[PDB]
Amino acid sequence: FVEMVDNLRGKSGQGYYVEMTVGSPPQTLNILVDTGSSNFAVGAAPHPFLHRYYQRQLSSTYRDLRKGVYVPYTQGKWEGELGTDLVSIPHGPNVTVRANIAAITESDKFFINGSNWEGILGLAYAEIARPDDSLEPFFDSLVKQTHVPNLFSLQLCGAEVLASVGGSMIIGGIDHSLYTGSLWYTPIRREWYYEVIIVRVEINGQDLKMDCKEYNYDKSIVDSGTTNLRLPKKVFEAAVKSIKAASSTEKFPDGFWLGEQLVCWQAGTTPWNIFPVISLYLMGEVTNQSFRITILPQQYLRPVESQDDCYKFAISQSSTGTVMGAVIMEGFYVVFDRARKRIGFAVSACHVHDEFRTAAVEGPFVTDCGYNI
Ligand SMILES: NC1=N[C@@]2(c3cccc(-c4cncnc4)c3)CCOC[C@H]2O1
């Protein structure tokens, strides 16, 4: 898997992208790696924030599906025209796929200024594809058309201009050089999003003591296309209360806790130790078991932007369930084992750790929590 190592790049807070080619001759595009959606969609017309876009008429292998697609999100939306074309990942498997492509012709608040990506690779399941589940997602096509095993893994690494980030998307396998210690698996509850179950949450060793249905109200997902850890209202408020208490030695503005305002310290003086660790316990493959992933402030305080180190609080409130976003995934090696309907976590080769604490994956812990039906 050596050629796939460090095949991801991005700007802090703006997603991780992989280089892809579309069409014949190949058109090079940077594509957001998104485990939270299921469409492959690319800019296909000029936009103020696009360096370049997919030009269908320049591809000898383009086929029009003669069907429109409209995709609204909570914030932002796009519309496009469906077709198929040949797609490759130059620093991926040595294969070429005929994939569905939504050619984006109009959009609002979708593309991001400076993100350096021109489209989105939805790696989740057909159930949440638009216009409906008959539009085969990219990974499904990849597996069907080639002999690539039905599994991929993500090693997202943490970090004027926004800090550059890097990582690896290993398609078709597990690269043992990218993690240390044991890989722990949590079941994929249903194949739509990458839905999982959280059974317990601790802040600095202290149980939040909530009925575990609260942690998965109305779902919990693993989402590389969301920056933050997003928590349901009740869980969010309890989490913030606890983090405040642990770091009470210092006082921060309200807008900070709201994930809006920055907090800055003299370069290199960031008081990491006043911020507590967060442990999320994920359901194990065995019914009464769980394992925990422990995240550090170095993950949930996200760097932004001279001689000041500034951060945003990368935990925020959700009304659509828990989202384990990029700041959670960072420093873990995360295996999306579609074949065995499970997601693996291990401590990443690029995990964060200071003198006293480290990101960890530990189990088992032994003791219903699923919410949506
Ligand atoms: N997962 C996900 N993908 C979505 C999305 C769309 C556009 C940009 C980004 C993004 C921005 N900034 C950092 N990362 C990603 C994420 C679309 C599907 O659901 C809503 C969003 O959440």
Tokens standing for residue 106: 């109009």
Does 126 lie in the same domain as 196? no
Supply the range of the domain harboring residue 255. Answer: 149-373
Does 228 lie in the same domain as 174? yes
Does 161 lie in the same domain as 114? no
Sheet holding 263-266, edge to edge: 263-266, 308-313, 301-303
In a domain, residue 353? The reply is: yes
* 19 secondary structure, DSSP code: E
Identify the CATH number of the domain in which residue 63 sits: 2.40.70.10
Atom 8 in ligand 1: residue holding the nearest Cα: 110
In a domain, residue 198? The reply is: yes
Q: What angle do CA 53, 55, 61 make, to 5 degrees?
A: 130
Taken as a whole, the chain contains a residue count of 373
In a domain, residue 9? The reply is: no
Q: What angle do CA 109, 114, 119 make, to 5 degrees?
A: 60
- C-beta of residue 341 within 8 angstroms of C-beta of residue 150: no
Beta-carbon contacts of 37 under 8 Å, excluding residues fewer than 6 positions away, are 120, 122, 123, 124, 128, 225
Atom of ligand 1 nearest to the CA of 16: 14
Neighbours of 286 (CB within 10 A): 10
Centre of ligand 1 to C-alpha 12, Å, is 14
Does 213 lie in the same domain as 228? yes
Atom of ligand 1 nearest to the CA of 74: 20
Q: Which of 128, 148, 168 lies at the terminal end of a domain, its last residue?
A: 148
Beta-carbon contacts of 116 under 8 Å, excluding residues fewer than 6 positions away, are 9, 10, 11, 14, 17, 30, 51
In a domain, residue 41? The reply is: yes
Does 267 lie in the same domain as 245? yes
Catalytic residue numbers, as ranges: 34, 223
Centre of ligand 1 to C-alpha 75, Å, is 9
Atom 4 in ligand 1: residue holding the nearest Cα: 225
Neighbours of 94 (CB within 10 A): 10
- C-beta of residue 109 within 8 angstroms of C-beta of residue 75: yes
- Assess whether the previous peptide bond of 364 is cis (omega < 30° from 0): yes
Centre of ligand 1 to C-alpha 254, Å, is 26
In a domain, residue 293? The reply is: yes
Q: What is the count of structural domains for the chain?
A: 2
For every residue of 201-219, DSSP letters joined together read: EEETTEE----GGGGGSS-
- C-beta of residue 244 within 8 angstroms of C-beta of residue 257: yes
Does 142 lie in the same domain as 155? no
Does 138 lie in the same domain as 26? yes
Measured in angstroms, the resolution is 1.4
Q: Which residues line ligand 1 (CB under 6 A)?
A: 14-15, 32, 34, 36-37, 73, 110, 112, 223, 225-227
In a domain, residue 4? The reply is: no
Does 169 lie in the same domain as 317? yes
- C-beta of residue 258 within 8 angstroms of C-beta of residue 236: no
The label of the residue with tokens 């997919």 reads 54
* 162 secondary structure, DSSP code: P
Q: Which of 99, 122, 148 lies at the terminal end of a domain, its last residue?
A: 148
Centre of ligand 1 to C-alpha 209, Å, is 31
For every residue of 81-129, DSSP letters joined together read: EEEEEEEE-TTS-S-EEEEEEEEEEEEES-S-TT----EEEE-S-GGG-
Does 28 lie in the same domain as 144? yes
* CA dist 134 → 31, 77, 211, 255 (Å): 23, 21, 37, 43
Atom of ligand 1 nearest to the CA of 225: 1
In a domain, residue 361? The reply is: yes
Does 347 lie in the same domain as 317? yes
Does 357 lie in the same domain as 244? yes
CA 32 to CA 156: how far, in whole Å? 13
Does 218 lie in the same domain as 165? yes
In a domain, residue 342? The reply is: yes
Q: Which of 85, 114, 148 lies at the terminal end of a domain, its last residue?
A: 148
Atom 10 in ligand 1: residue holding the nearest Cα: 225
